[PDB]
Structure formats: structure tokens, C-alpha cells
Write a structure and sequence with these properties.
The complex is a heteropentamer of chains A (194), B (276), C (240), D (100) and E (9). Chain A is mainly β. In chain A, 2% of the residues lie in helices and 50% in strands. Chain A contains 1 helix and 18 strands. In chain A, the strands form 4 sheets. In chain A, strands 2, 4, 5, 9, 10 and 11 form a 6-stranded mixed beta sheet that branches. In chain D, the strands form 2 sheets. In chain D, strands 1, 2, 5, 6 and 7 form a 5-stranded antiparallel beta sheet that branches. Helix content of chain D is 0%, strand content 47%. Classes of the chains: A mainly beta (194), B alpha+beta (276), C mainly beta (240), D mainly beta (100), E little secondary structure (9). β12 of chain A pairs antiparallel with β12 of chain C. Chain D: It is found in: Secreted; Cell surface.
Amino acid sequence: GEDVEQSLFLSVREGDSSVINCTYTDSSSTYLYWYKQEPGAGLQLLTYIFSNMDMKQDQRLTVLLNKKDKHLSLRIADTQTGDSAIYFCAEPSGNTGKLIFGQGTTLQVKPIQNPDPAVYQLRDSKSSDKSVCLFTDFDSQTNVSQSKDSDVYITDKCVLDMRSMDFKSNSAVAWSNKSDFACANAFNNSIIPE
Amino acid sequence: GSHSMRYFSTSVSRPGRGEPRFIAVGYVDDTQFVRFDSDAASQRMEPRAPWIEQEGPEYWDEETGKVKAHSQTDRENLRIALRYYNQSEAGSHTLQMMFGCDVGSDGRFLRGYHQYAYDGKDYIALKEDLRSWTAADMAAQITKRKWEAAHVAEQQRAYLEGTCVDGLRRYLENGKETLQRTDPPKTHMTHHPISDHEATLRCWALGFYPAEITLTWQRDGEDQTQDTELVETRPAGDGTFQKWAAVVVPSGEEQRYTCHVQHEGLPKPLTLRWEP
Amino acid sequence: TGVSQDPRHKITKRGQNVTFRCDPISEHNRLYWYRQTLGQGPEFLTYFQNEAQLEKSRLLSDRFSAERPKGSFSTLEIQRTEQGDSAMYLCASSLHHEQYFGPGTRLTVTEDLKNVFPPEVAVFEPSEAEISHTQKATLVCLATGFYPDHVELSWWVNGKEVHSGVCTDPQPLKEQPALNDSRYALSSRLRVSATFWQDPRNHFRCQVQFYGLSENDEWTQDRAKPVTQIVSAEAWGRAD
Amino acid sequence: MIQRTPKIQVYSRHPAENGKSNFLNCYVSGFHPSDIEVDLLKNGERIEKVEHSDLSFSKDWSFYLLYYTEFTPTEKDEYACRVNHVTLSQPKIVKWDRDM
Amino acid sequence: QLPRLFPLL
């Protein structure tokens, strides 16, 4: 009849506590999972609690369950940009061990690094002719939407970690085959709130 | 007082004359509340007391789907055991399991149960601490290693501490009039003299519930002997139980002995003697 | 250990048939298939208790069939594959209650194999303005004009795969996003010390692994067969 | 395996009074395996309207059935339970003693 | 009330 409800999307800052709730469908369910999907193909079991437990701690992970409310929550105490991924809560269904899954919560984790916004032009290693615009070191509250023009492609805000220097940077890319395409006037009207 | 709920599965292979046969029965205390039989037309968890008939549509559909999947599981369980014991398929065999749980007058959870028997012998049983298994033989040991890696005991504990209890309390409350009654035993004494020299004294407890009783003969003070005999407590068929205890004696010696009845009902344990 | 799955990518013509394999973890009596379309959580397909298929769904059509002969590996035949069935077909196996999932088979169903193009790759070298302003150098990789979206993009530095100072786009860009059949683009970035970038003994290779057509796939067009292949671009460190 | 010969009691729900409505019980306990054949017998003839309890077992995993039929005792009339098992080489007849 | 999952031997 009804379904395992969780939020589609959650944003959070390095070192904050990420908290994904879901509400599951049947009290009689003896076990409840969190699975994780990174960009790619591999769905990886994270942790599960038994219906006779309040709490379950596991390094940076903590799991709370309230059987009475059919309420389950996953908690991540320090949060890293690596923790970014889709988090699915999963409940047994019927007399098989078969699972119904939530729609999955995407964890966007924002760098706290001090912004230094800039746009640059890069040239093709083989053809001086071809160029891409880069927009980097911009604030995390800043968001890159796609183009108004249809001949111009803008990519999405994407977090990069140089681990030797403890450094993180949002960055986006844009390009075009248009004769008039201009790096200054690519992102400038694509700067939007969080 | 403290009450209990036991379901009893029984699967029996029928080489050549169909798929195995599955029969399960539900009890609270000494009172049976449901049945499923795989050979039946109905193909449904059927009720077995007039108090369990009040549970709503959901209960029946729910319970049928489960006892139906209980049967497909204990089916394949027979198949595995074959292989574990390298037994020929042409042979017929018997897997029984029994599980359930217990609560006190506080209505609070007390004990879990989850046990299997192959061909009339223990196989594997969950310890009262509900973290471990007792294996009966080196095939059970194979099961005990899988189940420890699977974390079966952690999952089954959740069922027993949870849905099992919840079930039992509802039944004690919907069925209170039946399940939470003590019927005192009706107690009379027959005498059939075997000869002029010796006579037979039978001590009767009829129409009592629950089944648990202790009937004790004694002569001129304490007497425990295999001179005494007891028949195993039998059901009257109306929801009460019967037991009788006999003792043999010399003639004109009938008042040297008394019979002593203990039961939950009786405020005082009774004494019975022979009046000609 | 972990569940296995053949093949990890599949491209079919619309209305041909397709069979996926899945080998679960040794001694695991329960096996479940799910499908998942990107953006969603997985939907249950069918369940096996050893050899026996004990549950299927309303979802599962006449067209869908699965088999676990021998109680081990399972297959999933999908017949008369319509575009609608383009999805990730996941396999899970369990001793009792804990399911472990496979890496899955990403299936793309296309009306005709003339819609399969492999990617064109380009590396763009960093700005004077970056190097000066930040003492850092960002390369951009640009992969464009590929269908389907079956790629794995990696950076290689002096022959070493770099697992830091990189973000590849989390997911690709459709050249015509409104249409379902449309080619794709994808960027990756590598950031380094401007001193790493200036050293001219330092090789930078961007590498896009495309998962295309097979030997058993049939091609009669005036174009190189779009087979499974690596396409890459290179830049050398520059004292400028 | 393990085999277990059935114990038998044959008895009446109530103290039997001649010409009163009662039920005749045959209880077969502590047997393995579960296959058993049971017949309640009027004199030597076989009653065709008997019912049996659903199949259960005790702590030792041994099975038990109850067999019952409605009946009205008569001072002349004799009443038997008859039982065949894989443990038994000939079927066992137990006469209903009124006092047991 | 019954369980929804039963162990395999």
C-alpha cells in the first residue's frame, strides 16, 4: 500500500553532523538497513539495526530507531567531502527477505575553504583554436545552473580535494563552438543561491 | 501467572506420492488457537478456537502467507538434511520445529524458544540466552557455523522479543475468558478389589485446566514407590484435562493411605480417602 | 568474494533479447534481482530459495524470465527489449537476512546501433592567470559525442592512476537533454602544484574507457565499428 | 531415525451413565513417526463418523492425537480403540473399561 | 503471530 519515505537531497558543511531520517512501513520488520551508492554502479551495505535496539554506533556512523513511530535515522558525526553519495534506507517486505528501498538521500557536503572566485580560459594541448572556460575557488553557497543559449554547455559544481595541501575547491566548466563565445559572459548570469 | 505461546511445525517427506506434507499448530498455554495443513483444500491458517475468530481480515491473509512460506522453507530444509547425512532420496524423513515465547503476570517478556528435531531427535536449539545454538551432531555443527556467520540468532531474537510477545498479549486480552481461567479439578475415588486378599484404589482428577497437576498417594505418612502408577495427563476434548493415579493394597487396609492433588486452581491441596 | 555479474554493460537493438548472469557469494541460499533507474532506489524483480523461484512481481512482464538452475548462478532473460527497460539490473545474495549486492549490469536499449558513437577526448592546459594567482594548475579533460553513457574516465601521471586532486563530473551532459536518445558529454579536472605542471619530464594522460559493441554485434556502415575501447588525450609539462 | 511405540488410553469425556449423551475418546501419545492408523470400534464393528485432533507433539518430539466420536453407552455395548503403527507388527485393540 | 523469515539448515 504505502512506501519507505526519505528526503531526496541533503546539503551539509565539512565537520557538521549529517542526519538522514526515514519512516518505514511495518513494525514487525526486525531489521532495517542503510546502503550507500557512490558515483558508479556499486551498492554497498553500510549498517543495520535490529527492531529490539534503540541505538547502534559504528565509528563515525550512529543509527537510532523508534519502532513505535517506525522512525529510523542515520547520523555521521564529523562529515568529509568523501561522505558525499546517495544513502538508501531499506526494509524487509513480506515472507521472503526481499527489500523495499527509499528513493535515496543525496548528501552534498560543502567545503569550508575560504572562497577566491575566478574564471579562466584554457587552450587545447593539440589545437590552440579550441578553448574551455573554468570557474573555480567559488563559494559553496554559489550554484552553477546550465546555459540560456543551447550551443553553450555548462557543467555542475564539483568538489576537488588536493590532499597534500588540505585544500578543497568547487569548480565548474563551460564550452561552445560559437564564434562569439566569451569566458567573462558564460557563468555570470548562471550564479544562483543554494 | 506466567503465560506462553508455542507454534509446532511438522514436515514429512513422501517420496513418489507428492511433495512433503506440512502441518503446523498454534497454542497459547494448553489451548490450541490455529492450524494449517498443506494437504487441506482451504490452503489457509484456519482458526481453532472461537476467541481467535474475532481477529480482522488482515490477520488471516497475513498468517496464511507466512505459514505458507514457513512450509516452503521447512520443505528445502528436509532437502538440505538429506545431503548433510548423505541419505538416499527414496527414504522418508521428519523435520519438526517448535518456537514461541513466554511472559509473566507483569505481561513482560521472560523466555524465547526456537528448536528443530530431525527424525525424532534434537538437531539444533537456541540457548535461553538467545545468542547461541546447541548442535546435537556434526551436521547441526554445520548449521551452527552458518547461522553464527548469518547472525540468525540476532534476527530471531528481534522476532521473539517483539512480534511474538505483542501477539501473545493481544490473545491473552481478546481471549481472557478462556486463557486466563483456572478450572479446579473434580476429584472422586473408585475401588476395584483384584481379589479377597488385595484391592485397587484409583484417585481421579477430572475436568481441570491447565494440564499441569501432581497426584501423590501416601500410606501412614510419606510414600513414593513404583508400587504406585500414573497415566499421562489426557485431554477430555472439551478444553479440560483428565488424570488418574492408582495404588494396590491389602484388604481392610484402605484408610492407611491417602491421595494428594496439587493444581493452580485449588487454594488448598486436597486429600482423598475411601468410604465403602 | 562479493557477488559477480556478466556483463557489466550491455547495448541491444530495440526488440532483440538479452541475458544477464549473476554468481552470488558461495553457500548463499537466497538470491534477489532488483532493477534501478538512475535517480531512484531499486525495485524488487524476483527471489530464489536455491533452485526455486518463490516470488515475482506485477512489475515482471511475460517478457521477463529468470532461472537459477543448479542452485548457484542465476540468469535473467529480457525478451523484445523496449527502451523503457533501459536500467541498472542489480543482483543480491544472502545466507539469511543480510543481502550483499553485485556491481550490476547497466543495460542501454537503442532503436538502432547507428546511434552508438565512441567519445572524442581533449585535455585543456591551465591558465597563466591560475598559475600566477594561485601557484596551482588545473587541467580539464573533455569527452564529447558518446552514446551510450557507458564510460570510466581516469587521470594518469607518469603512468600512475591519480586518486587525488581530481573530480570527474558526478554524471554526464546530454547534447539534446529534452530527447531520451541524445549523445553525451563529460568533463574531469586534475589540479596540481604549478611546479608539477612546469617540470617538462611530467606526462599527463586523460583516459576515457568506452563500453561499446561486441564481435557478435553486426556493423555494416562506412564508419569504424564502435567497439569497447580506450580513447585518451595527453599534455606534457611546460616551463611556460 | 528414532521410533517410539504409541501409548493408548480409551475413555469417556464424562463419567458414563447408561443412556446419557457422551463422547468416546482414544488418545494415542508418545509415538514416532507421525503415520498412524486409528479406528474406534463398536463391539467388533468400525464407527465411520470419528474425528481426530490436529497433529501436535510433546517435549520429547513424540506425536499425540485425540480421536473422538459422540455416543450413548448401553450396559451390554462393548467399545474398542484399534491402532496400527510401523512400530507394531499387528494392530493393537484396547477395550473401553468404564472405570479404566 | 508468526515470523516473516525462517532459517535454512
